[PDB]
Design a protein around this ligand. Structure first.
Ligand code: UIR
Ligand code: CA
Length: 223
């Protein structure tokens, strides 16, 4: 997260860290046994880390649970990042509490101008590399489809939206991939792609979760 602030320990209780001996992606807890993340975060060997603030110190409230399986959207395209969404089933159910809690899926899509909260442990500089120990937060609005398409002509599908700031300085970045975009208490986006980080006229692009609720529900019920 570039241009953001320290969230405060366990203030974003649905945020998870995907770990394979290091933090590589975020995700969101959607019930006690399932996490939503980005398909481009797929790999084998994933440990899900819940209840984290400082990802480099055991502070208390952490739960570490192996992934039992990871379900990449069958129509994910690695070229275009269309359908950049994946479900992860936990080997055992998380213990839900005030510091580890699920986030609601949306019942309708969010409109342009809606203010959202984006969170992650990704890089905090636009030029250079600086990864934080603790969780960072960014408030950002959803942009109109016309502004999104003007920023990335030909590359925006109906399964994507832009969010952020055209004047630059404030964005998600590498290491934030897969994490949540929460608007009015509901999960509306997944950190997906962008052009650099926090560059002028190049806002972040996010998977549009409202297009996948029926797929998520059908997949979880059958697995
Ligand atoms: N908020 C953001 N500014 C933002 C920037 C970059 C990313 C992601 C993602 C990203 O931008 N790309 C490159 C990319 C670039 C442009 C594209 C792409 C893919 O598909 C269609 O158009 C990667 C996908 C190919 C696997 C992925 C990469 C992984 C760590 C950081 N990158 C996340 C967030
Ligand atoms: Ca920790």
């Amino acid at each position: 997260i570039v241009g953001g602030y320290t969230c405060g320990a366990n203030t974003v209780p649905y945020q998870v860290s995907l770990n394979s001996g290091y933090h590589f992606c975020g995700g969101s807890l959607i019930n006690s046994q399932w996490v939503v993340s980005a398909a481009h975060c797929y790999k084998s060997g994933i440990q899900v880390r819940l209840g984290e603030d400082n990802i480099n110190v055991v502070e208390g409230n952490e739960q570490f649970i192996s992934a039992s399986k990871s379900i990449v959207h069958p129509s994910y395209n690695s070229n275009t990042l269309n359908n950049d969404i994946m479900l992860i089933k936990l080997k055992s159910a998380a213990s839900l509490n005030s510091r580890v809690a699920s986030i609601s899926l949306p019942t309708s899509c969010a409109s342009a101008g809606t203010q959202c909260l984006i969170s992650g442990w990704g890089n905090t500089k636009s030029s250079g590399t600086s990864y934080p120990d603790v969780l960072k937060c960014l408030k950002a609005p959803i942009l109109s489809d016309s502004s999104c398409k003007s920023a990335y002509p030909g590359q925006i599908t109906s399964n994507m939206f832009c969010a952020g700031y055209l004047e630059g300085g404030k964005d998600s970045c590498q290491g934030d991939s897969g994490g949540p975009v929460v608007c009015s208490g509901k999960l509306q986006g997944i950190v997906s792609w962008g052009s650099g980080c926090a560059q002028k006229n190049k806002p972040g692009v996010y998977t549009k979760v409202c297009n996948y609720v029926s797929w998520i529900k059908q997949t979880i019920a059958s697995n």
